[PDB]
Amino acid sequence: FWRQTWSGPGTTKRFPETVLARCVKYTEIHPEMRHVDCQSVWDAFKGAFISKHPCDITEEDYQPLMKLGTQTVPCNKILLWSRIKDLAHQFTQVQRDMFTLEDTLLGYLADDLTWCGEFDTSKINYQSCPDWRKDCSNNPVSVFWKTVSRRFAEAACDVVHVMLDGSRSKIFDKDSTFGSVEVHNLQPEKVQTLEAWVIHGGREDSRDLCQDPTIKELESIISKRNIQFSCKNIY
Template sequence: MTYTERTGRVILVDIAAVVVMMSIIGYPGTGRMMAAGTTTVQRVNYSDAGTDPDLREIFIGRCADFKAGKVNPTVDLNELRMKNCTQLWELFSQAFKYHEACDVNQTMYEEFVNATAITIPANKSNFWDGWGIYDTVHAYAKEGRRAWSLEYTLVGYLINNLKFCGQEDETGFRYDSCPGPDECGFATGCVDAFWAEASVYFAKQAKGHVRVLFDSNREGGAFQNENSYFAQFELNNMRPDAVENVNIYLITMVNQEPGDNCSSSSIQQLTTILTQSGISYTCHDQPRDVLHLLCTDEIESEECLLQKDILESPTDVALPLTTGSASRTRSTIGVGCHAFIVISIYIIHNILHYT
């Protein structure tokens, strides 16, 4: 074997060794372990936007606002003083950071959710199910003054409408794309798993009389037992010793035909579950307090005509009319009395004159 042949063989052996090492430890920048002879793992592109670029700053800012009572003015500020926003951020981010987006489950958020826990007043808990009722629920809650939905607790407000997910390499956050709702499976993945754990916490805090709002025209029925955060994580975690009554509100949007009502099969399924759990309930079709709220935006609709006078401060309109009517009545009575007296005097005068 010539020197050139020996040199070439050594080079080939070195190249082969390098290839084997790279196949074992992974190519630079992939963060993946690959066995010899396997192909590179393809990066999954998800359907939703990636992690918010300023996620930490948004989180800390929201936390500070909530602690100051700027979000829900009915919270106990003394209780909130014990919350450390930086520590809460660390607990939150560690739950999914450096984990692949769909490899996150509910229990990974348990420590964070417990650290954010605050007291929810009795008779204030307001549950909901179905995105069609979302805006109505928050308008009805009135920033916690009328009711508390999960989004007006500390844990719910901190995370509501944020985009976030993790990855195993680089910064631990993934910024190009994240899974959309149920893309990883029901209640699985960075965002969905969080809301599952938060829903359990919210239900366990409920006490007294609580409400649950449904859209009567929800496709598939107002109450749905499958793939429902209310059914799977809230309804099943209400405490019968704490919750006295569940007020079921079936809401029909103005200018729509009513859908499900209190006698519908989906609501009967819900009431059966409540009865079996030992929790009493009442059901309301189109409750007036919610209808009044809906009518503020649809004042001219036929359904709201009866509500119109109420919403336009009837006292301010009626009082001048009532006062005017009373004045006119008094004036009429006065004129009548005067005429009666004049006529009486005239008659008496004539009688005396001719006798």
């Protein structure tokens, strides 16, 4: 009758140190980001999520961080953020030729980390954080990715790509970052085509997943934005 915990992993151990070190490294390598004050970046990031219930985070909380992390991207070579992470697999040439969200400062900072705070202190919660499936799908991590990927989609032009997980119960899912935020922020003035690569999980070459009802739903959304749609099965 009284909630005792969140259901998800707590904040990654050493999170503050890790984010700061990543900021220092990225901004020493990238010739256009030398202006960045990594301490200010950390302060803005921490300020987004501390001293609040984790589920109460909103995109607006990340706006100070977004401002500090402003950065141009190569619009015509974007591979959007999706539930396919690792790289698909060993798509070596694709990785060479595509710009992914973790290739930006802000995506690089947060990649492969978990974080949250708590309502009653300004401390980082290392004990547990909301699980997307069990507690709340809009949490400090997922809302961070919604905020950054919104801007990323807005920047895209020409042919934009996304990799979809052909093994998911909803291959295109309106609740994912891609389905809730990115797809709706592709700009028809800039984007010619959205091409979805649907990654198969095996069973040789099974069904044509580009005919899946959820892909038809995606095709409809994109068509209504006056952008071309292309789907390919990647086996």
